[PDB]
Amino acid sequence: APQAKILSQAPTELELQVAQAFVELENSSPELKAELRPLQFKSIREIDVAGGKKALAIFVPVPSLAGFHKVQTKLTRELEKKFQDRHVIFLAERRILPKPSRTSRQVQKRPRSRTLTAVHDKILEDLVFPTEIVGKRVRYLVGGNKIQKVLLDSKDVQQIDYKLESFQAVYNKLTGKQIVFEIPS
RNA sequence: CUCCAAUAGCGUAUAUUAAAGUUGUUGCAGUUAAAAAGCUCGUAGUUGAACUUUGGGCCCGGUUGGCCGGUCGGAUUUCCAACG
């Protein structure tokens, strides 16, 4: 069955639910047979948004995040209607290699793409996927906590304008860092 | 003659230390008092932008998230995450 060939080996029941959501468009197929055939994903984590909704995180192997970005906007519409009370987002399963200490040595020098401070930057670029980020500010409060601030492009913002409350919860669950989104005009 | 200072000790000479921020690492000065090479290149020497992840528990402050409005769009904070 083509449902089971997307997930890793066995798991899980939730991975099948999104798997059926793909083949209802692969078998409908206005144009999607030429682009949704090779697209496959790795896992779903369910993140509880602070409101009544929840968030779906789709993890992509990333030789194919560019492939997913072709149908990203259209596919999210056909995932939100057949999965109510949810917000669907697409992320890439990136690898983070630990910083070498003066004792914990390795072989094979660690590329800058594997550093943790670069992977978290690529999460923000991939959470919001349209509306390219036009800036970042970090507030160091008097108390001692740090609050980021992501400035988004004003054009095409109406595709994610409701999902700013969801994105702050997702990035907190993966990084533990506070985010506020601000849209300059 | 009287008085002062130290006193079984007191003066003199030379050296040296403090004084001396008058050798300056701490810590000098260089327009006119002494002192910015006529100017530029240049080796040694001295100096050189930014960037690469947060596991023990308990008490304290916030800042977000709600269970909570008390109230005529703002007014108190507590029990709970983790967020450093």
Swiss-Prot record:
In Pfam terms, one family for this protein is Ribosomal_S7e
Q: Where is this cross-link: Glycyl lysine isopeptide (Lys-Gly) (interchain with G-Cter in ubiquitin)?
A: K81, K82, K122
Instruction: Reply yes or no: does the keyword Cytoplasm apply.
Output: yes
User: What does UniProt give as GO cellular component?
Assistant: 90S preribosome; cytosol; cytosolic small ribosomal subunit; nucleolus; nucleoplasm; small-subunit processome
Q: Which UniProt keywords apply?
A: Acetylation, Cytoplasm, Isopeptide bond, Nucleus, Ribonucleoprotein, Ribosomal protein, Ribosome biogenesis, rRNA processing, Ubl conjugation
How would you describe the post-translational modification of this protein?
N-terminally acetylated by acetyltransferase NatA.
Compartments reported by the entry: Cytoplasm; Nucleus, Nucleolus
Please provide the Gene Ontology terms (biological process) for this protein.
cytoplasmic translation; ribosomal small subunit biogenesis; ribosome biogenesis; rRNA processing
Give GO terms: molecular function aspect only: structural constituent of ribosome
The record makes one more remark, namely: Present with 41000 molecules/cell in log phase SD medium. There are 2 genes for eS7 in yeast.
Q: Which family is annotated?
A: Belongs to the eukaryotic ribosomal protein eS7 family.
Q: Assembly and interactions?
A: Component of the small ribosomal subunit (SSU). Mature yeast ribosomes consist of a small (40S) and a large (60S) subunit. The 40S small subunit contains 1 molecule of ribosomal RNA (18S rRNA) and 33 different proteins (encoded by 57 genes). The large 60S subunit contains 3 rRNA molecules (25S, 5.8S and 5S rRNA) and 46 different proteins (encoded by 81 genes). Interacts with snoRNA U3. uS11 interacts with MPP10. Component of the ribosomal small subunit (SSU) processome composed of at least 40 protein subunits and snoRNA U3.
Q: What biological function has been recorded for the protein in this entry?
A: Component of the ribosome, a large ribonucleoprotein complex responsible for the synthesis of proteins in the cell. The small ribosomal subunit (SSU) binds messenger RNAs (mRNAs) and translates the encoded message by selecting cognate aminoacyl-transfer RNA (tRNA) molecules. The large subunit (LSU) contains the ribosomal catalytic site termed the peptidyl transferase center (PTC), which catalyzes the formation of peptide bonds, thereby polymerizing the amino acids delivered by tRNAs into a polypeptide chain.
Q: What is this protein called?
A: Small ribosomal subunit protein eS7A
Q: Which organism is it from?
A: Saccharomyces cerevisiae (strain ATCC 204508 / S288c) (Baker's yeast)
- The gene behind this protein is RPS7A
